[PDB]
């Protein structure tokens, strides 16, 4: 969710 | 009988297999997507033990002819772990080195960016995105401030280039993490099987790019994203  | 094993990304392994049909020997090679740049040397069952920079000069009936490039730089399978990004962080990738460079981004307040050294056509692999391998839980459970370089590899692995490796002076084995974001990107992240880094992602052009053009990719954050991203998003929807 917190990554490209 | 020479055998060529091509990966969907364009790269390939070539050489004579042993009695067990395995890519094992001192004359095996991994050939990059340009079908010209290669790492020639010792491989065991397809795994690079000691590959030397070379050029695929020609091929006759499937038999390749390589000639070594000047130098003593050798490469080997060096898959990263959660804590080790590379055994030689300052040894650049020869294919990537001839296609991209880092400089100040053209995007205001975006820091450094990744630029093309050459004019190339659509679907060209330009850079590699190697990094340490961590879990999605670890990434999603921490502050955005620590996820500036995180890129999902698959359902179970996230690639990261954490401090101080985010500085070219500390790490230049790969440079994919230096490509900035754009909603009108000229590149995409794509899967890549690297002889040195193993399974990672690469930066591939979506179309023609010119020499010295800044390479950008759509970070694809769920529309949960940094402020600069949300700002550029508004500025994008509008105008
Ligand atoms: N379009 C953009 N506008 C402003 N900052 C950006 C943009 N795209 C990327 N960035 C910045 O770059 C980071 C992502 C990095 N993977 C990009 C390379 C980075 N600019 C560097 O100098 O190392 C983010 O955490 C931002 O600080």
Short mmCIF file of N, CA and C in Angstrom, two decimals, chain B residues 106-168:
data_model
loop_
_atom_site.label_atom_id
_atom_site.label_comp_id
_atom_site.label_asym_id
_atom_site.label_seq_id
_atom_site.Cartn_x
_atom_site.Cartn_y
_atom_site.Cartn_z
N UNK B 106 14.23 17.89 -13.89
CA UNK B 106 13.67 19.07 -14.54
C UNK B 106 12.40 19.45 -13.78
N UNK B 107 11.90 18.51 -12.99
CA UNK B 107 10.71 18.71 -12.18
C UNK B 107 11.10 19.53 -10.96
N UNK B 108 10.44 20.66 -10.77
CA UNK B 108 10.74 21.54 -9.65
C UNK B 108 10.63 20.87 -8.28
N UNK B 109 11.68 21.02 -7.48
CA UNK B 109 11.74 20.46 -6.13
C UNK B 109 11.62 18.94 -6.07
N UNK B 110 12.02 18.27 -7.14
CA UNK B 110 11.95 16.81 -7.18
C UNK B 110 13.31 16.16 -6.90
N UNK B 111 14.32 16.98 -6.63
CA UNK B 111 15.65 16.45 -6.35
C UNK B 111 16.36 15.96 -7.60
N UNK B 112 16.98 14.79 -7.51
CA UNK B 112 17.67 14.24 -8.67
C UNK B 112 16.70 13.44 -9.51
N UNK B 113 17.04 13.27 -10.79
CA UNK B 113 16.21 12.51 -11.70
C UNK B 113 17.07 11.60 -12.57
N UNK B 114 16.41 10.75 -13.34
CA UNK B 114 17.11 9.82 -14.21
C UNK B 114 16.94 10.27 -15.66
N UNK B 115 18.04 10.35 -16.39
CA UNK B 115 18.02 10.82 -17.77
C UNK B 115 18.61 9.84 -18.77
N UNK B 116 18.08 9.85 -19.99
CA UNK B 116 18.57 8.97 -21.03
C UNK B 116 19.84 9.52 -21.68
N UNK B 117 20.77 8.63 -22.00
CA UNK B 117 22.02 9.02 -22.66
C UNK B 117 21.87 8.89 -24.16
N UNK B 118 20.81 8.20 -24.58
CA UNK B 118 20.61 7.93 -25.99
C UNK B 118 19.17 8.01 -26.50
N UNK B 119 19.04 8.15 -27.81
CA UNK B 119 17.72 8.18 -28.43
C UNK B 119 17.37 6.72 -28.66
N UNK B 120 16.23 6.29 -28.12
CA UNK B 120 15.78 4.92 -28.29
C UNK B 120 14.29 4.86 -28.61
N UNK B 121 13.86 3.72 -29.14
CA UNK B 121 12.47 3.55 -29.51
C UNK B 121 11.63 2.99 -28.38
N UNK B 122 10.36 2.69 -28.67
CA UNK B 122 9.45 2.14 -27.67
C UNK B 122 9.92 0.80 -27.11
N UNK B 123 9.48 0.51 -25.89
CA UNK B 123 9.76 -0.75 -25.20
C UNK B 123 11.22 -1.08 -24.95
N UNK B 124 12.03 -0.06 -24.70
CA UNK B 124 13.45 -0.26 -24.46
C UNK B 124 13.77 -0.28 -22.97
N UNK B 125 14.42 -1.35 -22.52
CA UNK B 125 14.84 -1.45 -21.12
C UNK B 125 15.97 -0.44 -20.96
N UNK B 126 15.85 0.45 -19.97
CA UNK B 126 16.85 1.49 -19.76
C UNK B 126 17.60 1.42 -18.45
N UNK B 127 16.92 0.97 -17.40
CA UNK B 127 17.54 0.97 -16.09
C UNK B 127 17.00 -0.17 -15.24
N UNK B 128 17.73 -0.52 -14.18
CA UNK B 128 17.30 -1.60 -13.30
C UNK B 128 16.94 -1.08 -11.93
N UNK B 129 15.93 -1.70 -11.32
CA UNK B 129 15.49 -1.30 -10.00
C UNK B 129 15.79 -2.41 -9.00
N UNK B 130 17.03 -2.44 -8.52
CA UNK B 130 17.44 -3.41 -7.52
C UNK B 130 17.33 -2.71 -6.18
N UNK B 131 17.32 -3.50 -5.12
CA UNK B 131 17.24 -2.94 -3.78
C UNK B 131 17.11 -4.09 -2.81
N UNK B 132 17.01 -3.78 -1.52
CA UNK B 132 16.84 -4.82 -0.51
C UNK B 132 15.41 -5.34 -0.64
N UNK B 133 15.18 -6.55 -0.15
CA UNK B 133 13.87 -7.19 -0.23
C UNK B 133 13.21 -7.27 1.14
N UNK B 134 12.09 -6.57 1.28
CA UNK B 134 11.36 -6.57 2.54
C UNK B 134 9.89 -6.90 2.30
N UNK B 135 9.14 -7.11 3.38
CA UNK B 135 7.74 -7.46 3.26
C UNK B 135 6.81 -6.25 3.13
N UNK B 136 5.63 -6.50 2.58
CA UNK B 136 4.63 -5.46 2.41
C UNK B 136 4.18 -4.93 3.76
N UNK B 137 4.09 -5.82 4.74
CA UNK B 137 3.66 -5.43 6.07
C UNK B 137 4.63 -4.41 6.67
N UNK B 138 5.93 -4.67 6.55
CA UNK B 138 6.93 -3.76 7.08
C UNK B 138 6.82 -2.39 6.43
N UNK B 139 6.66 -2.39 5.11
CA UNK B 139 6.54 -1.14 4.35
C UNK B 139 5.27 -0.37 4.68
N UNK B 140 4.13 -1.04 4.59
CA UNK B 140 2.85 -0.40 4.85
C UNK B 140 2.66 0.04 6.30
N UNK B 141 3.43 -0.54 7.21
CA UNK B 141 3.30 -0.20 8.62
C UNK B 141 4.24 0.89 9.11
N UNK B 142 4.94 1.55 8.19
CA UNK B 142 5.87 2.61 8.57
C UNK B 142 5.55 3.94 7.89
N UNK B 143 6.18 5.01 8.38
CA UNK B 143 5.96 6.36 7.86
C UNK B 143 6.35 6.54 6.40
N UNK B 144 5.53 7.28 5.66
CA UNK B 144 5.79 7.56 4.25
C UNK B 144 7.19 8.10 4.03
N UNK B 145 7.73 8.77 5.04
CA UNK B 145 9.06 9.35 4.95
C UNK B 145 10.12 8.29 4.64
N UNK B 146 9.82 7.04 4.99
CA UNK B 146 10.74 5.93 4.75
C UNK B 146 10.42 5.13 3.50
N UNK B 147 9.36 5.53 2.79
CA UNK B 147 8.96 4.80 1.59
C UNK B 147 9.11 5.61 0.31
N UNK B 148 10.14 6.44 0.23
CA UNK B 148 10.35 7.23 -0.97
C UNK B 148 10.84 6.37 -2.12
N UNK B 149 11.56 5.30 -1.79
CA UNK B 149 12.11 4.41 -2.83
C UNK B 149 11.54 2.99 -2.85
N UNK B 150 10.41 2.76 -2.18
CA UNK B 150 9.83 1.42 -2.17
C UNK B 150 9.01 1.11 -3.43
N UNK B 151 9.26 -0.06 -4.00
CA UNK B 151 8.55 -0.52 -5.20
C UNK B 151 8.19 -1.99 -5.02
N UNK B 152 6.90 -2.30 -5.16
CA UNK B 152 6.44 -3.67 -5.01
C UNK B 152 6.99 -4.54 -6.14
N UNK B 153 7.49 -5.72 -5.78
CA UNK B 153 8.03 -6.65 -6.77
C UNK B 153 6.93 -7.63 -7.13
N UNK B 154 6.26 -8.14 -6.10
CA UNK B 154 5.17 -9.08 -6.26
C UNK B 154 4.31 -9.06 -5.00
N UNK B 155 3.43 -10.05 -4.86
CA UNK B 155 2.55 -10.12 -3.70
C UNK B 155 3.26 -10.31 -2.37
N UNK B 156 4.50 -10.79 -2.40
CA UNK B 156 5.23 -11.02 -1.16
C UNK B 156 6.52 -10.24 -0.97
N UNK B 157 6.95 -9.50 -1.98
CA UNK B 157 8.20 -8.77 -1.84
C UNK B 157 8.15 -7.32 -2.30
N UNK B 158 8.77 -6.45 -1.51
CA UNK B 158 8.86 -5.03 -1.83
C UNK B 158 10.35 -4.71 -1.92
N UNK B 159 10.73 -4.03 -3.00
CA UNK B 159 12.12 -3.64 -3.20
C UNK B 159 12.32 -2.24 -2.65
N UNK B 160 13.41 -2.02 -1.93
CA UNK B 160 13.69 -0.70 -1.37
C UNK B 160 15.16 -0.30 -1.50
N UNK B 161 15.39 1.01 -1.59
CA UNK B 161 16.73 1.56 -1.66
C UNK B 161 16.76 2.56 -0.51
N UNK B 162 16.94 2.05 0.72
CA UNK B 162 16.98 2.87 1.93
C UNK B 162 18.26 3.66 2.14
N UNK B 163 18.21 4.62 3.05
CA UNK B 163 19.37 5.42 3.39
C UNK B 163 20.46 4.44 3.81
N UNK B 164 21.73 4.72 3.44
CA UNK B 164 22.21 5.87 2.67
C UNK B 164 22.38 5.51 1.20
N UNK B 165 21.85 4.36 0.82
CA UNK B 165 21.96 3.89 -0.56
C UNK B 165 21.19 4.74 -1.57
N UNK B 166 20.37 5.67 -1.08
CA UNK B 166 19.61 6.55 -1.97
C UNK B 166 20.50 7.64 -2.56
N UNK B 167 21.77 7.62 -2.17
CA UNK B 167 22.75 8.58 -2.66
C UNK B 167 23.66 7.84 -3.64
N UNK B 168 23.85 8.43 -4.82
CA UNK B 168 24.69 7.80 -5.84
C UNK B 168 26.11 7.54 -5.34
#
